[PDB]
Design a protein around this ligand. Structure first.
Ligand SMILES: Nc1ncnc2c1ncn2[C@@H]1O[C@H](COP(=O)(O)O)[C@@H](O)[C@H]1O
Ligand SMILES: [Mg+2]
Ligand SMILES: [Mg+2]
Lengths: 394, 394
């Protein structure tokens, strides 16, 4: 399989002063083709380093795509870099120069001298029309290789890329991917359960990505291999998979409450309202979520029904159970969730940061899960939210 | 100036399944140092291409920083690729292994076999301790050059990076950035109001950056020029500036409550818990924040003290005042904040998304502000949270 190289040009991209979504978006558009994307680059607006990166990318790849630096400014140098990298001179296209003059005439302005350089192309390039912006793009076919220069602004380049891409004659490969969202199983145990199913090959691969909402498992590559492989993986992870694709825990909870015609409330200590925030992130939450309380002080815990004998051990399974039962009673909801624990940075009741209990109470009784989350304060808080949501969808 | 190279390791980063903020963040951290950043890379989880990219970056750089791929799975291959790129064997460190085992034992687990590879290093590497994870990093000093391997999760690498960075003996340059945070004033009015102070030179520059917590005025460049210009700006915007640097509205509130010896409580509808989440984000919040109610249904509103007469008209200044008064009497706090209004996507009571009332109730009475916020549901929720906090600190 041959390579695709993707370079986003712009000094500000290095520093995240513009968030580089271009290179990712181009990479995802190449999924249907038999090309390997091994890396993406973001490159400073300097002609010599950029020419070097372009020359190296072009040498190793069937396709090179560059985005950005097609402006009129001294910091727009991609055309110069590309010409330098490919050993071709820049040539003024008078007709395209006329088009750029027209762009400014149409807005009531003369063309600035600076923009004149946007009418430059190398002999190996055909123009890609840009009816939304000043700078036409290039399509270079050289050596059985393709190099495409696109403008930085998405509303400019997306239609240009969409039209040129099926013209490049790229090898096609029937592609699929399957994303499995788990909870309550760490990467190590997933490794062990999958064994040889944890395939890393050219035709198909398996990846795990640990998130605050649990470990995601992604199978991607050839459509035949993916469907089979991912189905075996799902069967092996069956109890821990709570959703696939775009599903989120908050959406999964909503689906269960709608399926049952049930309602929900919450009582939170350490998460501070973040659980209610996460449940109500999803439009239509008011159909099942009656509301909640944030029992942050001891006085509030007692006010909302935590038994007095548990106030010395609010970090405990017993208190979690009591809080969920109290919320269920206080709101008259079908179910209720509770969070209690040690966020960090300090211990609480002799328990170390990351000690968390979550509880769910319902018409058949309550249940509690204990966690010892590694992470700083903000992290432990977030895992706690998802742990509590996970009690509803296992 | 010598080069710093920065590689984010992760197949998911290429496709933007996780947006790579790590490389940009590390690049920003290096601005006080006289190292050039010509490019940044994201690299797939594949050992041969990764080893090639690492070998090349190390050859050309004074400093190489890798982020990610230190997990226990077959797609975590950074250690092996670095070992290949530097020509050194990986060797199990029995001591680190003992620490990982202890880490799992504390959590009530035996250490899984797949974790063993996290205690592997090359002879040139010293360990960088990761108290928040099972993967410690590496610092390799070899031939006058540094290569640092960090965990992917920002809560994990950030403290590790902060501590090793001064120890690298990198050449310094006098750079600084000052961030002035304002509320209640648009970019246009700021630009216009500073005027000659809105400098954009090679030495120093002033930028405006709209955020959900108000428009930031960032001054950056040569330390001396930054510091002087920043003082002159904060004077021109003295009415508008509520904080600088790492100050947040939630920390400002905490400083005010502690200074008064006062307490706070909340009652929230559209924000769904997010306001109590943001207050409690800051360590020490239990010294003043008593707790809150998420009144997300008519039944919850009534039960916690909102008058029957208002329950049908939730998008109103009267409802926001009554909520803040109901929270303050329920929790007995010195102050109480409330949010009500239209998050989106749907209109409510004839009012569009973005129509929000925030209220504060205090010793001397209640105050309400109406906003009309731009943005999608999550954005309106966020801006509402800050607008409620702003009542206390602007
Ligand atoms: N790599 C990139 N990813 C996403 N957006 C980009 C990129 N490069 C430029 N832009 C967008 O193009 C516009 C500014 O480009 P410029 O002003 O030419 O640097 C803004 O809308 C940017 O967000
Ligand atoms: Mg640019
Ligand atoms: Mg990874």
């Amino acid at each position: 399989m041959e390579r695709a190289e993707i370079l986003g040009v712009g000094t500000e991209l290095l520093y995240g002063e513009t968030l580089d979504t271009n290179t990712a978006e181009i990479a995802r558009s190449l999924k249907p083709y038999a090309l390997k994307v091994e890396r993406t680059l973001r490159v400073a607006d300097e002609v010599a380093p950029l020419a070097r990166e372009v020359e190296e990318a072009f040498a190793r790849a069937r396709l090179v795509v560059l985005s950005g630096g097609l402006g009129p400014t001294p910091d727009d140098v991609t055309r110069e870099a590309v010409a330098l990298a490919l050993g071709e001179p820049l040539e003024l296209d008078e007709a395209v120069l006329g088009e750029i003059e027209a762009f400014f005439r149409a807005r009531g302005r003369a063309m600035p001298e600076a923009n004149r350089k946007q009418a430059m192309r190398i002999p190996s390039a055909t123009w890609l029309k840009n009816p939304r912006g000043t700078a036409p793009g290039w399509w270079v076919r050289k050596g059985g290789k393709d190099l495409v220069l696109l403008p930085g602004p998405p509303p400019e380049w997306r239609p240009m890329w969409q039209e040129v891409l099926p013209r490049l004659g790229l090898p096609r490969r029937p592609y699929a991917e399957r994303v499995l969202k788990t909870w309550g199983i760490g990467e190590s145990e997933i490794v062990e359960r999958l064994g040889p199913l944890f395939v890393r090959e050219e035709e198909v691969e398996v990846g795990t990505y640990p998130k605050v909402h649990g470990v995601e498992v992604v199978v991607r590559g050839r459509e035949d291999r993916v469907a089979e492989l991912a189905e075996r993986i799902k069967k092996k992870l069956l109890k821990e998979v709570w959703g696939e694709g775009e599903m989120t825990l908050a959406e999964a909870v909503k689906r269960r409450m709608e399926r049952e015609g049930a309602t929900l409330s919450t009582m939170e200590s350490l998460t501070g309202g973040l659980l209610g925030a996460e449940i109500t992130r999803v439009p239509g939450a008011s159909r099942f979520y009656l509301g909640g309380v944030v029992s942050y002080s001891v006085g509030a815990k007692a006010r909302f029904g935590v038994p007095q004998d548990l106030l010395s051990r609010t970090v405990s399974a017993e208190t979690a159970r009591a809080m969920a039962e109290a919320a269920r009673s206080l709101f008259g909801s079908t179910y209720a969730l509770a969070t209690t624990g040690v966020a960090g940075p300090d211990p609480l009741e002799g328990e170390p940061p990351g000690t968390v209990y979550v509880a769910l109470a319902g018409p058949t009784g309550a249940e509690v899960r204990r966690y010892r989350f590694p992470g700083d304060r903000e992290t432990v808080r977030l895992r706690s939210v998802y742990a509590a949501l996970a009690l509803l969808v296992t």
